[PDB]
Amino acid sequence: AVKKFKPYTPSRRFMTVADFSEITKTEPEKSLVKPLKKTGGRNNQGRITVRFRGGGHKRLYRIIDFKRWDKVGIPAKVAAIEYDPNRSARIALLHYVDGEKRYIIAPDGLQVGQQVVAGPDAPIQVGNALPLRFIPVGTVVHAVELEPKKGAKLARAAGTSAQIQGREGDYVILRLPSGELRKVHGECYATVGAVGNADHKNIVLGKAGRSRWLGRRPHVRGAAMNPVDHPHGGGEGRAPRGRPPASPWGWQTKGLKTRKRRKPSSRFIIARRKK
Amino acid sequence: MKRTWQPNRRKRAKTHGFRARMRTPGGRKVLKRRRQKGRWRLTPAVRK
RNA sequence: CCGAGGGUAGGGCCCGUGACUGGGGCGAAGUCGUAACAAGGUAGCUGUACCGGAAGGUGCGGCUGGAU
RNA sequence: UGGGAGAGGGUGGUGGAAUUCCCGGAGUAGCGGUGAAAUGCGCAGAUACCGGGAGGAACGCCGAUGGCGAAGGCAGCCACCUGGUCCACCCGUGACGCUGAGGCGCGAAAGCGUGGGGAGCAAACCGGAUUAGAUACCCGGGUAGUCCACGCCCUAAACG
RNA sequence: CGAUGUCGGCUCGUCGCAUCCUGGGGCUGAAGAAGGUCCCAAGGGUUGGGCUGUUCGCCCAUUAAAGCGGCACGCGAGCUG
RNA sequence: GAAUGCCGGCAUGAGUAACGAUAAAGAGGGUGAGAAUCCCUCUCGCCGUAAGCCCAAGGGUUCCUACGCAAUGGUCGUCAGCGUAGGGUUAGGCGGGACCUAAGGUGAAGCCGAAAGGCGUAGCCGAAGGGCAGCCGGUUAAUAUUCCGGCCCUUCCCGCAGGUGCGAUGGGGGGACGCUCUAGGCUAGGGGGACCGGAGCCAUGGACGAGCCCGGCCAGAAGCGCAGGGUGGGAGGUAGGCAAAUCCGCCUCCCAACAAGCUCUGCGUGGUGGGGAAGCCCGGGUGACAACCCCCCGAAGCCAGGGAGCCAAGAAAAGCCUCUAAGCACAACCUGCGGGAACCCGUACCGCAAACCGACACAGGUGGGCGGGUGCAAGAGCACUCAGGCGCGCGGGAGAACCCUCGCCAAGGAACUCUGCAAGUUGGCCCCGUAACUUCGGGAGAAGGGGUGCUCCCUGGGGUGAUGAGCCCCGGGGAGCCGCAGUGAACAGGCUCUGGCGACUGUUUACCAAAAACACAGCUCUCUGCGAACUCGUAAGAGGAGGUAUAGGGAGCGACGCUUGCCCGGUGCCGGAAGGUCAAGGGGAGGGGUGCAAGCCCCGAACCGAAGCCCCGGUGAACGGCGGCCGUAACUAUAACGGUCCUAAGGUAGCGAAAUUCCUUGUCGGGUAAGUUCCGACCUGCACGAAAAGCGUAACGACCGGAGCGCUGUCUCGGCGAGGGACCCGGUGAAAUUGAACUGGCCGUGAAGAUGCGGCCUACCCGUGGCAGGACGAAAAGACCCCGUGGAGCUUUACUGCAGCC
RNA sequence: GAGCUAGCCCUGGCCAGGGUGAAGCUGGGGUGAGACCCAGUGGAGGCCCGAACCGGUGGGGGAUGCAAACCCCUCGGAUGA
Ligand SMILES: *[C@H]1C[C@@H](CC(C)C)C[C@H]2CN[C@H](C(=O)N[C@H]3[C@H]4O[C@H](SCC/C=C\[C@H]3C)[C@H](O)[C@@H](O)[C@H]4O)[C@@H]2O1
Ligand SMILES: [K+]
Ligand SMILES: [Mg+2]
Ligand SMILES: [Mg+2]
Ligand SMILES: [Mg+2]
Ligand SMILES: [Mg+2]
Ligand SMILES: [Mg+2]
Ligand SMILES: [Mg+2]
Ligand SMILES: [Mg+2]
Ligand SMILES: [Mg+2]
Ligand SMILES: [Mg+2]
Ligand SMILES: [Mg+2]
Ligand SMILES: [Mg+2]
Ligand SMILES: [Mg+2]
Ligand SMILES: [Mg+2]
Ligand SMILES: [Mg+2]
Ligand SMILES: [Mg+2]
Ligand SMILES: [Mg+2]
Ligand SMILES: [Mg+2]
Ligand SMILES: [Mg+2]
Ligand SMILES: [Mg+2]
Ligand SMILES: [Mg+2]
Ligand SMILES: [Mg+2]
Ligand SMILES: [Mg+2]
Ligand SMILES: [Mg+2]
Ligand SMILES: [Mg+2]
Ligand SMILES: [Mg+2]
Ligand SMILES: [Mg+2]
Ligand SMILES: [Mg+2]
Ligand SMILES: [Mg+2]
Ligand SMILES: [Mg+2]
Ligand SMILES: [Mg+2]
Ligand SMILES: [Mg+2]
Ligand SMILES: [Mg+2]
Ligand SMILES: [Mg+2]
Ligand SMILES: [Mg+2]
Ligand SMILES: [Mg+2]
Ligand SMILES: [Mg+2]
Ligand SMILES: [Mg+2]
Ligand SMILES: [Mg+2]
Ligand SMILES: [Mg+2]
Ligand SMILES: [Mg+2]
Ligand SMILES: [Mg+2]
Ligand SMILES: [Mg+2]
Ligand SMILES: [Mg+2]
Ligand SMILES: [Mg+2]
Ligand SMILES: [Mg+2]
Ligand SMILES: [Mg+2]
Ligand SMILES: [Mg+2]
Ligand SMILES: [Mg+2]
Ligand SMILES: [Mg+2]
Ligand SMILES: [Mg+2]
Ligand SMILES: [Mg+2]
Ligand SMILES: [Mg+2]
Ligand SMILES: [Mg+2]
Ligand SMILES: [Mg+2]
Ligand SMILES: [Mg+2]
Ligand SMILES: [Mg+2]
Ligand SMILES: [Mg+2]
Ligand SMILES: [Mg+2]
Ligand SMILES: [Mg+2]
Ligand SMILES: [Mg+2]
Ligand SMILES: [Mg+2]
Ligand SMILES: [Mg+2]
Ligand SMILES: [Mg+2]
Ligand SMILES: [Mg+2]
Ligand SMILES: [Mg+2]
Ligand SMILES: [Mg+2]
Ligand SMILES: [Mg+2]
Ligand SMILES: [Mg+2]
Ligand SMILES: [Mg+2]
Ligand SMILES: [Mg+2]
Ligand SMILES: [Mg+2]
Ligand SMILES: [Mg+2]
Ligand SMILES: [Mg+2]
Ligand SMILES: [Mg+2]
Ligand SMILES: [Mg+2]
Ligand SMILES: [Mg+2]
Ligand SMILES: [Mg+2]
Ligand SMILES: [Mg+2]
Ligand SMILES: [Mg+2]
Ligand SMILES: [Mg+2]
Ligand SMILES: [Mg+2]
Ligand SMILES: [Mg+2]
Ligand SMILES: [Mg+2]
Ligand SMILES: [Mg+2]
Ligand SMILES: [Mg+2]
Ligand SMILES: [Mg+2]
Ligand SMILES: [Mg+2]
Ligand SMILES: [Mg+2]
Ligand SMILES: [Mg+2]
Ligand SMILES: [Mg+2]
Ligand SMILES: [Mg+2]
Ligand SMILES: [Mg+2]
Ligand SMILES: [Mg+2]
Ligand SMILES: [Mg+2]
Ligand SMILES: [Mg+2]
Ligand SMILES: [Mg+2]
Ligand SMILES: [Mg+2]
Ligand SMILES: [Mg+2]
Ligand SMILES: [Mg+2]
Ligand SMILES: [Mg+2]
Ligand SMILES: [Mg+2]
Ligand SMILES: [Mg+2]
Ligand SMILES: [Mg+2]
Ligand SMILES: [Mg+2]
Ligand SMILES: [Mg+2]
Ligand SMILES: [Mg+2]
Ligand SMILES: [Mg+2]
Ligand SMILES: [Mg+2]
Ligand SMILES: [Mg+2]
Ligand SMILES: [Mg+2]
Ligand SMILES: [Mg+2]
Ligand SMILES: [Mg+2]
Ligand SMILES: [Mg+2]
Ligand SMILES: [Mg+2]
Ligand SMILES: [Mg+2]
Ligand SMILES: [Mg+2]
Ligand SMILES: [Mg+2]
Ligand SMILES: [Mg+2]
Ligand SMILES: [Mg+2]
Ligand SMILES: [Mg+2]
Ligand SMILES: [Mg+2]
Ligand SMILES: [Mg+2]
Ligand SMILES: [Mg+2]
Ligand SMILES: [Mg+2]
Ligand SMILES: [Mg+2]
Ligand SMILES: [Mg+2]
Ligand SMILES: [Mg+2]
Ligand SMILES: [Mg+2]
Ligand SMILES: [Mg+2]
Ligand SMILES: [Mg+2]
Ligand SMILES: [Mg+2]
Ligand SMILES: [Mg+2]
Ligand SMILES: [Mg+2]
Ligand SMILES: [Mg+2]
Ligand SMILES: [Mg+2]
Ligand SMILES: [Mg+2]
Ligand SMILES: [Mg+2]
Ligand SMILES: [Mg+2]
Ligand SMILES: [Mg+2]
Ligand SMILES: [Mg+2]
Ligand SMILES: [Mg+2]
Ligand SMILES: [Mg+2]
Ligand SMILES: [Mg+2]
Ligand SMILES: [Mg+2]
Ligand SMILES: [Mg+2]
Ligand SMILES: [Mg+2]
Ligand SMILES: [Mg+2]
Ligand SMILES: [Mg+2]
Ligand SMILES: [Mg+2]
Ligand SMILES: [Mg+2]
Ligand SMILES: [Mg+2]
Ligand SMILES: [Mg+2]
Ligand SMILES: [Mg+2]
Ligand SMILES: [Mg+2]
Ligand SMILES: [Mg+2]
Ligand SMILES: [Mg+2]
Ligand SMILES: [Mg+2]
Ligand SMILES: [Mg+2]
Ligand SMILES: [Mg+2]
Ligand SMILES: [Mg+2]
Ligand SMILES: [Mg+2]
Ligand SMILES: [Mg+2]
Ligand SMILES: [Mg+2]
Ligand SMILES: [Mg+2]
Ligand SMILES: [Mg+2]
Ligand SMILES: [Mg+2]
Ligand SMILES: [Mg+2]
Ligand SMILES: [Mg+2]
Ligand SMILES: [Mg+2]
Ligand SMILES: [Mg+2]
Ligand SMILES: [Mg+2]
Ligand SMILES: [Mg+2]
Ligand SMILES: [Mg+2]
Ligand SMILES: [Mg+2]
Ligand SMILES: [Mg+2]
Ligand SMILES: [Mg+2]
Ligand SMILES: [Mg+2]
Ligand SMILES: [Mg+2]
Ligand SMILES: [Mg+2]
Ligand SMILES: [Mg+2]
Ligand SMILES: [Mg+2]
Ligand SMILES: [Mg+2]
Ligand SMILES: [Mg+2]
Ligand SMILES: [Mg+2]
Ligand SMILES: [Mg+2]
Ligand SMILES: [Mg+2]
Ligand SMILES: [Mg+2]
Ligand SMILES: [Mg+2]
Ligand SMILES: [Mg+2]
Ligand SMILES: [Mg+2]
Ligand SMILES: [Mg+2]
Ligand SMILES: [Mg+2]
Ligand SMILES: [Mg+2]
Ligand SMILES: [Mg+2]
Ligand SMILES: [Mg+2]
Ligand SMILES: [Mg+2]
Ligand SMILES: [Mg+2]
Ligand SMILES: [Mg+2]
Ligand SMILES: [Mg+2]
Ligand SMILES: [Mg+2]
Ligand SMILES: [Mg+2]
Ligand SMILES: [Mg+2]
Ligand SMILES: [Mg+2]
Ligand SMILES: [Mg+2]
Ligand SMILES: [Mg+2]
Ligand SMILES: [Mg+2]
Ligand SMILES: [Mg+2]
Ligand SMILES: [Mg+2]
Ligand SMILES: [Mg+2]
Ligand SMILES: [Mg+2]
Ligand SMILES: [Mg+2]
Ligand SMILES: [Mg+2]
Ligand SMILES: [Mg+2]
Ligand SMILES: [Mg+2]
Ligand SMILES: [Mg+2]
Ligand SMILES: [Mg+2]
Ligand SMILES: [Mg+2]
Ligand SMILES: [Mg+2]
Ligand SMILES: [Mg+2]
Ligand SMILES: [Mg+2]
Ligand SMILES: [Mg+2]
Ligand SMILES: [Mg+2]
Ligand SMILES: [Mg+2]
Ligand SMILES: [Mg+2]
Ligand SMILES: [Mg+2]
Ligand SMILES: [Mg+2]
Ligand SMILES: [Mg+2]
Ligand SMILES: [Mg+2]
Ligand SMILES: [Mg+2]
Ligand SMILES: [Mg+2]
Ligand SMILES: [Mg+2]
Ligand SMILES: [Mg+2]
Ligand SMILES: [Mg+2]
Ligand SMILES: [Mg+2]
Ligand SMILES: [Mg+2]
Ligand SMILES: [Mg+2]
Ligand SMILES: [Mg+2]
Ligand SMILES: [Mg+2]
Ligand SMILES: [Mg+2]
Ligand SMILES: [Mg+2]
Ligand SMILES: [Mg+2]
Ligand SMILES: [Mg+2]
Ligand SMILES: [Mg+2]
Ligand SMILES: [Mg+2]
Ligand SMILES: [Mg+2]
Ligand SMILES: [Mg+2]
Ligand SMILES: [Mg+2]
Ligand SMILES: [Mg+2]
Ligand SMILES: [Mg+2]
Ligand SMILES: [Mg+2]
Ligand SMILES: [Mg+2]
Ligand SMILES: [Mg+2]
Ligand SMILES: [Mg+2]
């Protein structure tokens, strides 16, 4: 339920912020944070390799458990749900009966006080982790491993999910968050439910300072530049593209496919994304 | 106004000093040429 | 002190007028098509929406004030 | 108090038919479409047939001159929540009633906002015909929309 | 072209006369008044404003008149820009 | 003898400009060969959120003292940051190191690269961050938290005593954190005192006074008091914290739970140690047995790791505490006490500046802390002033033009001008009041107005204290008084109407453009399934991202509102298992060279054979494009309508003489006395038009138009006045420029604009202050223009390559 | 060569005073319950005025400068990109 503001500044006209109503714990688990080394988009050469990055709010990285098959059969209680500034999803704090504590990304509808568990025999309840083969066809799931024991890769952003379409040998068929139809191995772990904080898409940043808070530096159009800088650079007055629209590096940026040709995972893609 | 020389002993020794020169093929050549020419100082002097 | 009124400044309502513009009424024999009345030759009407020189057409839903 | 009929309303779930698309198979010279045609699709293997999958929408028969609702309107099936209504008994209150300017609420379709969804259909639009013309009627395409959630709009041959 | 700064304005003038006004004339289709046309005449004078960067031009209000042109389209080691 | 030649020397301009902030000087007395300039004294002026004081950087002896004045000092010099010499910087507690980690750097392991080298987990380095023990006063010509005095403390070693399962680079706890706002109690600091101490003072009309003037503290260990922070206790289970674990975590139970208790800081008190003014007399002495007390204001600092709210979600590691592991439990560790031990480097001085960065003793630049009082609503603003520090290292006259900075102005009031450029006006606070339009916030300080001082009387609430007094913060009512004038000085909006552009706050061409440009939230297209795409790198490796399609890259558009039409023929991109073409390679019909021959050697057709291209489709918020001629209505005119050629399709809505209109000052209307601009219309739009978006839009703007009100030295039209210069005298003394010069006007002449030639005219010799017409004046080997088979940046369907991709 | 400048990373610091008065909260009204209205409280914001601090709008001065970009008056931002 994204929150609005009365228009008492020009920027407060459209700014919307998340409602934070699902959050119940406001400082992180000291045992589970580490410092997030900001890059400014610079690689180990010191070179900008991703433009317009830098200068956002300070953040601590909350370690997240993307394995979960770490602790098969051990139930945990959902102690808290917390804000995580390193991802769009919210994170849930789990207290395992072990005593061990861990962060998972918080699926939708997950309730503080309920229990979750992981393994080939877990109940089909929001927050549980099973190998893909054991989750019934039709189940909407998130945090999906892409190869077994390699870590959850798919459907981690707020609101997203994959849906289990069917099975074929050792593989299940998923409809990924992008609409793609893909075969993922059935021993891959996935978590029951869709990711929470689905209102996230309707936040209206509202002013330019907001983008600066998030580490986003201003983005310059190639058509505002000179030839030495950009294929769209130059011209007397304003100018249309005057060539197929192109990146700063000269490749075409309206339609040109770029997935590698002979990539081995092609065997495992049923249908490319839609819409 | 703010001119271009803003002295700084640490900066000076870390940029032009003997150790920085030695740690590099071109810095070693700098020392070599200034020795061959008979410079009294091979590196800038800074109080430290 | 109050005080006719005068001055300054800013409001409200009305009347007249205005380059140009919008449709409206009217006008013996203008131009274009023929939408409606017969199943009017695509049954008609209808609220809405979009489109079209024009009457109109078409979508959606409604009515019989439609027919055989 | 005891019962009854009902597509009355809201949420959730869920069943088969049909179309479209996809994949596999089989098979070949046309299919489609009309008043007749043409555009269109088809040897890059369509149409017609079988099997598999995906997805959306509407619920055949029952079904009626039928039923329910104040109206708009409501139809597969199931559960839950809920409204109205009628009958029987003649038990309780004792005129506590009728209407109702304003007010408030509901209010087909279309349309609008923000998300989603998109099979079929189809304003706009393109093409093929027709015609003197044909910004139409017919044919082939087709986008909003038609569907869901929330919020607006408040109109009607909202008619008995 | 080892640089002669380029429009307009301002300031300051000065000169020519093919004279705008004022002075003197002849002719007039000059009754008077007023005017036309040409001759002599450069002494002095020749306004203030609206528009535009403008020169010029049009317009308002005047005037005896609101002259034209040269001086590196006079004048940026005088100003403006 | 010339090269705007090179090096050096010396001229000219010239006794010229200048002598560096317009805060400002005068006099007396000293010193000395010499004094406006050095020392002292009195008077005057300037800073005082500094122009004072304390840190950090940077500088490097500039510090102090004696003796000097050639040069340095924009004058002078006896003086000096200058010359010569001598002296001067003292730490277990301040800062840094023998402690910790941050980015980053380095880098056993390992990875990569022709070489050089590049990466890289740990580890190591790395600080203005963490951590850690000293406060007050005195002393020197010059150092002092360093020496000394007083009172405190830290660690290391050894010992004695008491206690304990002791023991770690290993486990855990803690360290440990944002922004805004903020409570209680304190402190720093400050104001008053009729109280306390003090040398004195009574003037000039008055005052011997509850008079004036000066001062009325600082540090402190244990103990105690006030205010805060931190923190649950016990037990049982236990599979987690990469071994162990009594610790930590998880579950249960019991108790304690606004509390308490324990613990730790801040403040106060506190043995005790210091300090202690004006004035007077010679830095010193006195004052003085100095006094050292009460009231008030009160932090942004302290208690602190406090509290609340918020979204953008806020370092690490050590010290420390706890757990246990090897081991050892004759050890070891903890507490208390005693004696001993405690190293290296910095420390002078300047430090908003004459000592640092600017070639200069340069009006510039330079981070942190303190920064007093009064009044002005507040404040670090402003005026004046304390402490303290200065008068800016040339002076003396004069009282021209002219310049600069400043003041005033009769009548007029934008007539000035490209433009109200500039300068006026307005100006703070309190109160009254306030329009269109609006996205309901705003527009708004709209506009426009009234009030504002001093005195007496009455009185309300808040803080302190006690509820009173007193001090203190806001006031309210009444009656008066004075002036030209009461935010009386200083600091402090001119306002309105209407248009264009851009939504907005922001950003930019360091040093001629701040804008309409860029960015911006927001919209759309497109790519990307993760060892993602993309980017940097030969690579390894990185970034993307410890992210995962509600994410990330690219591109255009640019809040919001209402919208965004037609064309896929060409280019791009996307799809297409057919066909056509297509390289190496496969294939080898069939030839050829040579040898006696086996053979060896070579050419080689059909045919099979990728991407790319052809070819078939799709696609516009992909590159882009969106007609011509002729005719027609019962007045005329004009054509809703028709005809025909052409196209891939012929520009829809909306807008239009426009940031676009050539003709053009279109035409009409408005505003004006008059309007090439402006605003409103019309539409034959040279040459608008829909995300290089189209049309609007409240609010916003040091943007650009147009108008009005106010007010003015802008102007008619100039006048006067101030100061700093200019000018004269004394001191110091540049510059570009310069073939040489004994350097006039006119009319001619001449390479076509003559001081220099001809003819004539004019003219005694040399300066000083002024003005700028000439010396085609100076400056710059024209930046425009061309030329050179000169150069460079940039483009592309120019050529040819290369990376990259296929 | 990034001791100037540009961007970023780490770690510190700074922003007088005044104004406006968002949400929320409480209470009151309202209703079947609500929406919502009023008051108080509250203290939000690329909010407003304005020093420091950061700028560099217009004009003037300066132009062999005090200065190879300065000076004076004026003006922009000043809790934020
Ligand atoms: C401008 C006029 C052009 C012709 C126009 C462009 C149609 C003709 C040249 C002829 N010479 C003059 C010239 O070149 N003057 C230059 C001056 O430079 C400065 S003055 C400021 C700049 C103005 C003009 C220059 C281009 C010097 O101080 C002057 O001495 C002179 O060199 C015309 O110029
Ligand atoms: K040119
Ligand atoms: Mg909002
Ligand atoms: Mg609102
Ligand atoms: Mg939440
Ligand atoms: Mg940690
Ligand atoms: Mg990273
Ligand atoms: Mg590194
Ligand atoms: Mg990039
Ligand atoms: Mg970046
Ligand atoms: Mg993310
Ligand atoms: Mg989150
Ligand atoms: Mg797999
Ligand atoms: Mg979104
Ligand atoms: Mg951020
Ligand atoms: Mg963006
Ligand atoms: Mg941009
Ligand atoms: Mg550009
Ligand atoms: Mg550009
Ligand atoms: Mg470049
Ligand atoms: Mg290039
Ligand atoms: Mg290019
Ligand atoms: Mg271009
Ligand atoms: Mg351009
Ligand atoms: Mg152009
Ligand atoms: Mg450009
Ligand atoms: Mg083009
Ligand atoms: Mg291109
Ligand atoms: Mg895909
Ligand atoms: Mg600078
Ligand atoms: Mg520096
Ligand atoms: Mg610096
Ligand atoms: Mg240093
Ligand atoms: Mg340093
Ligand atoms: Mg340095
Ligand atoms: Mg280095
Ligand atoms: Mg070095
Ligand atoms: Mg080498
Ligand atoms: Mg070597
Ligand atoms: Mg040398
Ligand atoms: Mg030597
Ligand atoms: Mg060197
Ligand atoms: Mg009267
Ligand atoms: Mg009809
Ligand atoms: Mg008909
Ligand atoms: Mg018909
Ligand atoms: Mg009909
Ligand atoms: Mg139609
Ligand atoms: Mg075919
Ligand atoms: Mg075939
Ligand atoms: Mg589908
Ligand atoms: Mg009864
Ligand atoms: Mg309705
Ligand atoms: Mg057709
Ligand atoms: Mg025909
Ligand atoms: Mg009916
Ligand atoms: Mg020339
Ligand atoms: Mg020359
Ligand atoms: Mg020259
Ligand atoms: Mg003038
Ligand atoms: Mg004359
Ligand atoms: Mg003119
Ligand atoms: Mg001319
Ligand atoms: Mg003209
Ligand atoms: Mg006359
Ligand atoms: Mg002339
Ligand atoms: Mg001429
Ligand atoms: Mg000419
Ligand atoms: Mg001239
Ligand atoms: Mg000039
Ligand atoms: Mg000129
Ligand atoms: Mg000149
Ligand atoms: Mg000249
Ligand atoms: Mg100009
Ligand atoms: Mg010669
Ligand atoms: Mg020379
Ligand atoms: Mg030479
Ligand atoms: Mg020579
Ligand atoms: Mg030379
Ligand atoms: Mg010599
Ligand atoms: Mg000489
Ligand atoms: Mg000489
Ligand atoms: Mg001389
Ligand atoms: Mg002289
Ligand atoms: Mg001279
Ligand atoms: Mg000079
Ligand atoms: Mg000078
Ligand atoms: Mg000054
Ligand atoms: Mg002055
Ligand atoms: Mg004197
Ligand atoms: Mg002297
Ligand atoms: Mg002397
Ligand atoms: Mg002096
Ligand atoms: Mg002296
Ligand atoms: Mg002061
Ligand atoms: Mg030095
Ligand atoms: Mg000397
Ligand atoms: Mg000597
Ligand atoms: Mg000297
Ligand atoms: Mg000097
Ligand atoms: Mg002497
Ligand atoms: Mg010393
Ligand atoms: Mg000591
Ligand atoms: Mg040691
Ligand atoms: Mg190496
Ligand atoms: Mg280091
Ligand atoms: Mg270190
Ligand atoms: Mg340190
Ligand atoms: Mg220390
Ligand atoms: Mg102490
Ligand atoms: Mg001594
Ligand atoms: Mg912490
Ligand atoms: Mg933390
Ligand atoms: Mg920290
Ligand atoms: Mg924040
Ligand atoms: Mg104290
Ligand atoms: Mg005070
Ligand atoms: Mg007396
Ligand atoms: Mg407990
Ligand atoms: Mg255990
Ligand atoms: Mg004393
Ligand atoms: Mg004594
Ligand atoms: Mg502070
Ligand atoms: Mg604190
Ligand atoms: Mg706190
Ligand atoms: Mg670390
Ligand atoms: Mg053992
Ligand atoms: Mg033993
Ligand atoms: Mg112990
Ligand atoms: Mg040692
Ligand atoms: Mg010292
Ligand atoms: Mg000092
Ligand atoms: Mg300064
Ligand atoms: Mg300072
Ligand atoms: Mg000094
Ligand atoms: Mg000086
Ligand atoms: Mg200076
Ligand atoms: Mg004081
Ligand atoms: Mg004030
Ligand atoms: Mg002075
Ligand atoms: Mg000064
Ligand atoms: Mg004089
Ligand atoms: Mg005055
Ligand atoms: Mg006057
Ligand atoms: Mg006036
Ligand atoms: Mg007036
Ligand atoms: Mg004017
Ligand atoms: Mg101008
Ligand atoms: Mg004022
Ligand atoms: Mg109005
Ligand atoms: Mg209003
Ligand atoms: Mg208005
Ligand atoms: Mg408006
Ligand atoms: Mg309003
Ligand atoms: Mg006012
Ligand atoms: Mg009054
Ligand atoms: Mg008075
Ligand atoms: Mg103001
Ligand atoms: Mg205009
Ligand atoms: Mg703007
Ligand atoms: Mg702009
Ligand atoms: Mg715009
Ligand atoms: Mg806008
Ligand atoms: Mg915008
Ligand atoms: Mg701002
Ligand atoms: Mg510039
Ligand atoms: Mg520039
Ligand atoms: Mg530059
Ligand atoms: Mg420059
Ligand atoms: Mg400028
Ligand atoms: Mg510009
Ligand atoms: Mg600006
Ligand atoms: Mg820009
Ligand atoms: Mg914008
Ligand atoms: Mg948008
Ligand atoms: Mg989108
Ligand atoms: Mg290589
Ligand atoms: Mg990473
Ligand atoms: Mg992006
Ligand atoms: Mg932009
Ligand atoms: Mg609107
Ligand atoms: Mg096309
Ligand atoms: Mg095509
Ligand atoms: Mg195409
Ligand atoms: Mg091929
Ligand atoms: Mg084109
Ligand atoms: Mg084209
Ligand atoms: Mg349209
Ligand atoms: Mg027009
Ligand atoms: Mg326009
Ligand atoms: Mg145009
Ligand atoms: Mg025109
Ligand atoms: Mg024109
Ligand atoms: Mg005109
Ligand atoms: Mg008019
Ligand atoms: Mg207009
Ligand atoms: Mg016209
Ligand atoms: Mg374009
Ligand atoms: Mg354009
Ligand atoms: Mg517009
Ligand atoms: Mg506006
Ligand atoms: Mg602006
Ligand atoms: Mg602006
Ligand atoms: Mg004047
Ligand atoms: Mg004077
Ligand atoms: Mg004389
Ligand atoms: Mg002299
Ligand atoms: Mg001298
Ligand atoms: Mg000669
Ligand atoms: Mg001579
Ligand atoms: Mg001469
Ligand atoms: Mg002469
Ligand atoms: Mg000639
Ligand atoms: Mg001549
Ligand atoms: Mg002569
Ligand atoms: Mg001669
Ligand atoms: Mg001669
Ligand atoms: Mg001769
Ligand atoms: Mg001669
Ligand atoms: Mg002669
Ligand atoms: Mg003569
Ligand atoms: Mg003289
Ligand atoms: Mg002179
Ligand atoms: Mg001259
Ligand atoms: Mg001149
Ligand atoms: Mg001349
Ligand atoms: Mg010449
Ligand atoms: Mg000349
Ligand atoms: Mg020059
Ligand atoms: Mg040259
Ligand atoms: Mg040349
Ligand atoms: Mg040149
Ligand atoms: Mg140039
Ligand atoms: Mg030329
Ligand atoms: Mg050539
Ligand atoms: Mg040639
Ligand atoms: Mg060339
Ligand atoms: Mg080139
Ligand atoms: Mg190569
Ligand atoms: Mg690529
Ligand atoms: Mg730097
Ligand atoms: Mg601030
Ligand atoms: Mg106020
Ligand atoms: Mg609250
Ligand atoms: Mg603000
Ligand atoms: Mg204000
Ligand atoms: Mg000004
Ligand atoms: Mg000058
Ligand atoms: Mg200059
Ligand atoms: Mg200045
Ligand atoms: Mg100023
Ligand atoms: Mg200002
Ligand atoms: Mg502020
Ligand atoms: Mg401000
Ligand atoms: Mg910030």
Curated annotation (Swiss-Prot), chain A:
Keywords: Ribonucleoprotein, Ribosomal protein, RNA-binding, rRNA-binding
Biased composition, class Basic residues, residue ranges: 256-275
One GO process term, biological-process aspect: cytoplasmic translation
Pfam family, one: Ribosomal_L2
Keyword Ribosomal protein recorded: yes
An example Gene Ontology CC term for this record: large ribosomal subunit
GO molecular function, one term: structural constituent of ribosome
Xref: PROSITE patterns: RIBOSOMAL_L2
Composition bias type Basic and acidic residues, residue spans: 229-239
Keyword RNA-binding included in the entry's annotation: yes
Disordered: region residues: 222-275
Protein family (similarity comment): Belongs to the universal ribosomal protein uL2 family.
Biological function: One of the primary rRNA binding proteins. Required for association of the 30S and 50S subunits to form the 70S ribosome, for tRNA binding and peptide bond formation. It has been suggested to have peptidyltransferase activity; this is somewhat controversial. Makes several contacts with the 16S rRNA (forming bridge B7b) in the 70S ribosome.
Subunit structure, as described in the record: Part of the 50S ribosomal subunit. Forms a bridge to the 30S subunit in the 70S ribosome, contacting the 16S rRNA. May also make transient contacts with protein S6 during translation in the 70S ribosome.
Designated name of the protein: Large ribosomal subunit protein uL2
Organism the protein comes from: Thermus thermophilus (strain ATCC 27634 / DSM 579 / HB8)
From Swiss-Prot, chain B:
SS bond partners: none
Keywords: Ribonucleoprotein, Ribosomal protein
Molecular function via GO: structural constituent of ribosome
Disordered: annotated span: 26-48
GO biological process: translation
Keyword Amino-acid biosynthesis: no
Comp. bias intervals (Basic residues): 29-48
Cellular-component GO terms for this entry: ribonucleoprotein complex; ribosome
Record-linked InterPro entries: Ribosomal_bL34, Ribosomal_bL34_CS
Pfam families: Ribosomal_L34 (PF00468)
Functional note: Found on the solvent side of the large subunit.
Further remark: The open reading frame (ORF) for this protein is entirely within the ORF for the RNase P protein (RnaP). The two start codons are separated by four nucleotides.
Family: Belongs to the bacterial ribosomal protein bL34 family.
Subunit structure, as described in the record: Part of the 50S ribosomal subunit.
NCBIfam families in alphabetical order: rpmH_bact
Name used for this protein in its record: Large ribosomal subunit protein bL34
